[PDB]
Amino acid sequence: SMNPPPPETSNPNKPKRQTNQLQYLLRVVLKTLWKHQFAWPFQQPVDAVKLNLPDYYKIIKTPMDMGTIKKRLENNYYWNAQECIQDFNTMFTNCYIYNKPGDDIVLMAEALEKLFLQKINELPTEE
Ligand SMILES: Oc1ccc(Cn2cnc(F)c2)c2cccnc12
């Protein structure tokens, strides 16, 4: 039930990078998803104390949220787009893992994933 430390958004011994794809992930992809009607559950780490999910972090061992992702992008925390895309997939996957099909929260994630996949279907080309 106690909340774990949120995932890092900076790390001095991790190399940082800025790429055109990563810029697009923040400017277009993340900030578009953010505004979706179903984004609000995924805009911050899950507060298992607030939401009364004392088993959340007993089940999910790689939490991830769009708020974390947003900070990581603004901080150049990622090396490449694929690293950032993998965080999105972790966030959707966590939601399917902790829940079951048909749940309102899963329908939310399912929709966001389709928009996400639509937006990353075509990324800009590297410079
Ligand atoms: O990422 C999440 C954020 C919030 C909640 C609580 N909650 C909010 N709205 C519904 F419908 C549920 C989650 C519940 C299960 C899995 N993930 C969750």
> 112: domain CATH number?
1.20.920.10
CA distance 28 to 26: 6
Check: CB of residue 76 under 8 Å from CB of residue 17: yes
The type of residue at 76 is N
Residue ID of nearest Cα to ligand 1 atom 9: 105
Within 10 Å of residue 82's Cβ, how many Cβ atoms?
10
In a domain, 5, yes or no: no
In a domain, 43, yes or no: yes
Ligand 1: does its nearest atom lie under 6 Å from the Cβ of 51? yes
State the method. Answer: X-ray
Check: CB of residue 94 under 8 Å from CB of residue 55: no
Q: Which domain holds residue 85?
A: 19-123
Contacting residues for 83 by C-beta, under 8 A, at least 6 apart? none
Name the one residue in this structure whose structure tokens are 């769009």.
66
CA distance 24 to 81: 9
In a domain, 14, yes or no: no
**Spacing, Cα 28 to ligand 1 middle (Å):** 25
In a domain, 76, yes or no: yes
Domain total of the chain: 1
* Resolution of the experimental model, in Å, one decimal: 2.0
Q: Which helix (H) or strand (E) holds 20?
A: helix 20-24
DSSP state, residue 40: G
C-beta contacts of 98-102 below 8 A and 24+ residues apart: 98/53, 98/56, 98/59, 98/60
Closest CA to 75 of 7, 4, 123, 1: 7
Residue ID of nearest Cα to ligand 1 atom 4: 41
CA distance 33 to 74: 16
